[PDB]
Amino acid sequence: YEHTAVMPNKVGIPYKALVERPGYAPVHLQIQLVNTRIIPSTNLEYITCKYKTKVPSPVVKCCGATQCTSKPHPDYQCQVFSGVYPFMWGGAYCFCDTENTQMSEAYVERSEECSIDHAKAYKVHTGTVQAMVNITYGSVSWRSADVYVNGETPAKIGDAKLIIGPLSSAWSPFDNKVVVYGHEVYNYDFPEYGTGKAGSFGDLQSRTSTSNDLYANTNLKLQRPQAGIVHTPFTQVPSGFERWKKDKGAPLNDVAPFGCSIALEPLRAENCAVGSIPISIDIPDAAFTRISETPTVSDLECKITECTYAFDFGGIATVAYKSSKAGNCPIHSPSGVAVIKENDVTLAESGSFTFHFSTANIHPAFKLQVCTSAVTCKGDCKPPKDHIVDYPAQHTESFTSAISATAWSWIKVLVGGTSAFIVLGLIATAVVALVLFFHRH
Amino acid sequence: YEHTAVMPNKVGIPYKALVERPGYAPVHLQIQLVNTRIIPSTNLEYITC
Amino acid sequence: IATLAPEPLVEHKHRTLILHLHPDHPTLLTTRSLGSDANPTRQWIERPTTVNFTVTGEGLEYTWGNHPPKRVWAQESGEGNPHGWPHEVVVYYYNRYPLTTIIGL
Structure with a gap:
């Protein structure tokens, strides 16, 4: 039998519902969420790490000149310095005074630390949503399996067969472009593999972690050797990967709203709480019993002994029944004023039991069913002494739930007696026209 | 649980109260005084004989 | 292996969380709210200070140093009597609903 309703998107709290079938006793249905993962689709664009500029050995032409070719290398540089006359150990290097050549070639290559700490530049495309759902009904225990959040995949x-409906909102905490460094993600823009400002983020881009091709602009410039010694001096701006690692904001796992814990290996956004989830579960007829088998009850009167405004289950009430025979029947409340802690009851012949509930109202006028029979409960509640608790609310706060009976009588005369006084004022005009008409004829 | 009240300044008469924690049974509380000493601070000036 | 900061002294108020932080090293404190508006704050604590955070019914999550994050939710304790004279009925709903009592009156 198909049960169709709407479940709110929360993880900790369960969803309680009583399934009504004509000619059959109702059963208790519990749906509880464990995980809620939003998994977008990502393609890796490029990686970034600190560079390592390695220079080859320069040549020392004694009496002559040298030229260079455009070798294929990232950020390759060449120059020619004329008239160097270098000095090494054991006297001078060459004969020809005030005419000599030094090569001083340099180029940029990635570091050996690029395989350990690198930033992965991902482009985010919208994807699929899945969840894990705990299910029980009737008398069988809790057992769970992974489900899909769409409108086309029964599980x-x-x-039974369960179809978890699509989310009410398409909100996702990820941007279009994200950066994954270590175990945290960021919402950052890219130089898009073509550009690079040589000191901010894209001074060294490689397509994969072991790609042969490598883009690198770093403002590398050759400098003249000085006073006749053999070395190749260069000048370049510092790394952008180090500058990004200092001038960095907060990660997305410290920034994302709705309590979205972010994992890494499928790049999920776990346990967000937004919107609602429609449900459709088809419970088989093997868990349905008849009206003749279940007992009937009568003479139900209810008294609330203690109620509290607080979270968790701060209310406790005892009810009195008169059952036809012993057995088990579920209890459930349709209205959202009070939730119920437990599902079933061990009934007897003319006894009484207590149950625990949870309201967010000063005066709960909630109503619950026992053994497909009706009873109502009324009472009063007191504010709690706790200021801050470590657990979320079990109930649902409404708009009229905060109105006390003293203040409700105060606003029943400011809108009831005043608006009926204008009615008293308006009928005086309606009767003075009748008297003035009777003066004529 | 914190329970604040006002007791009188009588020595032999105990103060009986009933604390009320919600969701729990009330607990009887009895406070009684056995002494009451007011001790001023003194500095000796001189002796005489 | 990294240092662990001493735990803060936590005292509660009405929709207000107070933390007494006493660091011996420059320590990072990040807070965020679990509602629609996250309102993220971050600062480095180098001296013994005290900070107040407005915890609502939706919640608040704060991390201090290398400690795991903690989530706290504010209840509805209130500061008034809802039944009685209207000089104390109004002051009960002013603390609970300061945005509707001024407009509604």
Whole structure:
């Protein structure tokens, strides 16, 4: 039998519902979420790491000149310095005074630390949503399996078949372009593999972690050797990967709203709480019993002994029944004023039991069913002494839930007696026209 | 649980109260005084004989 | 292996969380709210200070140093009596609803 309703998108709290079938006793249905993962689609664009500029050995032409060719290398540089006359150990290097050549070639290559700490530049495309759902009904225990959040994939959980409907909102915490460094992600823009400002983020881009091709602009410039010694001096701006690692903002896992914990290896956004989830579960007829088998109850009167405004289950009430025979029947409340802690009851012949509930109202006028029979409960509640708790609310706060009976009588005369006084004022005009008409004829 | 009240300044008469924690049974509380000493601070000036 | 900061002294108020932080090293404190608006704050603490954060019913999550994050939710304790004279009925709803009592009156 198909049960169709709307479940709010929360993880900790369960969803309680009583399934009504004509000619059959109702059953208790519990749906509880464990995980809620939003998994977008990503393609890796490029990686970034600190560079390492390695220079080859320069040549020392004694009496002559040298030229260079445009070798294929990232950020390759060449120059020619004329008239160097270098000095080494054991006297001078060459004969020809005030005419000599030094090569001083340099180019840029990635570091050996690029395989350990590198930033992965991802482009985010919208994808699929999945969840893990705990299911029980009737008398069988809790058992769970992974489900898909769409409108086309039923999942076989238990003896029933469950279709978890799509999310009400398409909100995702990820941007179009993200950067993954270590175990945290960031919302950052890219130089898009073509550009690079040589000191901010894209001074060294490689397509994969072991790609042969490498883009690198770093403002590398050759400098003249001085006073006749053999070395190749260069000048370049510092790395952009180090400058990004200092001038960095907060990661997305410290920034994302709705309590979205972010994992890494499929790049999920776990346990967000936004929107609602429609449900459709088809419970088989093997868990349905008849009206003749279940007992009937009567003479139900309810008294609330203690209620509290606080979170968790701060209310406790005892009810009195008169059952036809012993057995088990579920209890459930349709209205959202009070949730119920437990599902079933061990009934007896003319006894009484207590149950625990949870409201967000001063005066709960909630109503619950026991053994497909009706009873109502009324009472009063007191504010709690706790200021801050470490657990979320089990109830749902409404708009009229904060109105006390003293203030409700105060606003029943400012809108009731005043608006009816204008009615008293308006009928005086309606009767003075009748008297003035009767003066004529 | 914190329970604040006002007791009188009588020595032999105990103060009986009933604390009320919600969701729990009330606990009886009895406070009694056995002494009451006011000790001023003194500095000796001189002796005489 | 990294240092662990001493735990803060936590005292509660009405929709207000107070932390007494006493660091011996420059320590990072990041807070965020679990509602629609995250409102993220971050600062480095080098001296013994005290900070107040407005915790609502949706919640608040704060991390201090290398400690795991903690989540706290504010209850509805209130500062008034809802039944009685209207000089104390109004002051009960002013603390609970300061945005509707001024407009509604």
